[PDB]
Design a protein around this ligand. Sequence first.
Ligand code: L2P
Ligand code: LFA
Ligand code: LFA
Ligand code: BOG
Length: 219
Amino acid sequence: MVGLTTLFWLGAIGMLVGTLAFAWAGRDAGSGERRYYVTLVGISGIAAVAYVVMALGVGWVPVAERTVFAPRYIDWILTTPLIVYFLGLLAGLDSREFGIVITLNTVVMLAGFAGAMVPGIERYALFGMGAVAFLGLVYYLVGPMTESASQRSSGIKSLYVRLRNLTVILWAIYPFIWLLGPPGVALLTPTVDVALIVYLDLVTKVGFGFIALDAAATL
Ligand SMILES: CC(C)CCC[C@@H](C)CCC[C@@H](C)CCC[C@@H](C)CCOC[C@@H](CO)OCC[C@H](C)CCC[C@H](C)CCC[C@H](C)CCCC(C)C
Ligand SMILES: CCCCCCCCCCCCCCCCCCCC
Ligand SMILES: CCCCCCCCCCCCCCCCCCCC
Ligand SMILES: CCCCCCCCO[C@@H]1O[C@H](CO)[C@@H](O)[C@H](O)[C@H]1O
């Protein structure tokens, strides 16, 4: 229990550091820019709360012979569409296309959560639904959204592509962790699972945020 608790506290601290840095960076509150900072505060702030809750030993749900971390999935349901929103803003995406990518994202996270909570082998059908919706989300990120980003200045398009790449490459690792970890075949221990996810969560949220902060200043 000590290892898992320690990892969750590290996640909480890293998320808190991001949250404070984004809130501070955003204080200037430029009318067009404010939205991006508030979104980053929401992304890392919600994650921080989730990690604190888990560190305190809340929401460790036993499912068959594994443990499900409910706050992790609730976190993702809330924070991943905020990341997609940030990317859609950057890309200058149209309202229909925003709706599509937010829908596909929500399918991924709901299917992953539901799958984690189903004891039997039918849970892999839920994983599959999420994997299919994720391929759709990736298509949008690398296709239509990238085309949309090209209508922006070269610097904004470069930022879009940088954050798009970070997002696509790291998000693609999560389903493999689900499959190899406790929700799937339970090869990886809960500690190894949590350690990998803490890194990935921190980079996809706080790393993502610092990359945007850097580009915003350099712009
Ligand atoms: C906008 C809405 C339409 C979307 C709402 C999300 C919704 C879709 C989530 C669906 C799942 C929902 C049905 C939950 C059911 C889970 C339940 C079956 C699990 C069993 O319950 C286990 C409990 C305690 O043991 O864990 C319980 C887990 C914890 C109690 C919850 C974990 C906390 C969250 C991860 C953090 C939430 C964010 C903060 C409330 C806001 C922080 C703001 C920030 C800026 C400080
Ligand atoms: C300006 C730099 C600020 C960076 C934001 C993150 C703050 C550091 C918080 C500690 C992070 C813990 C490291 C966990 C890594 C993933 C699990 C590794 C276990 C081997
Ligand atoms: C482009 C592909 C990248 C290579 C990654 C390899 C694929 C990862 C395999 C994940 C699912 C395989 C399930 C078999 C795991 C072994 C079962 C052990 C039981 C505890
Ligand atoms: C959920 C899985 C979805 C699979 C990804 C295929 C979606 C892309 O499919 C494409 O959509 C375009 C809209 O931008 C259309 O113009 C194209 O005709 C169509 O081929």
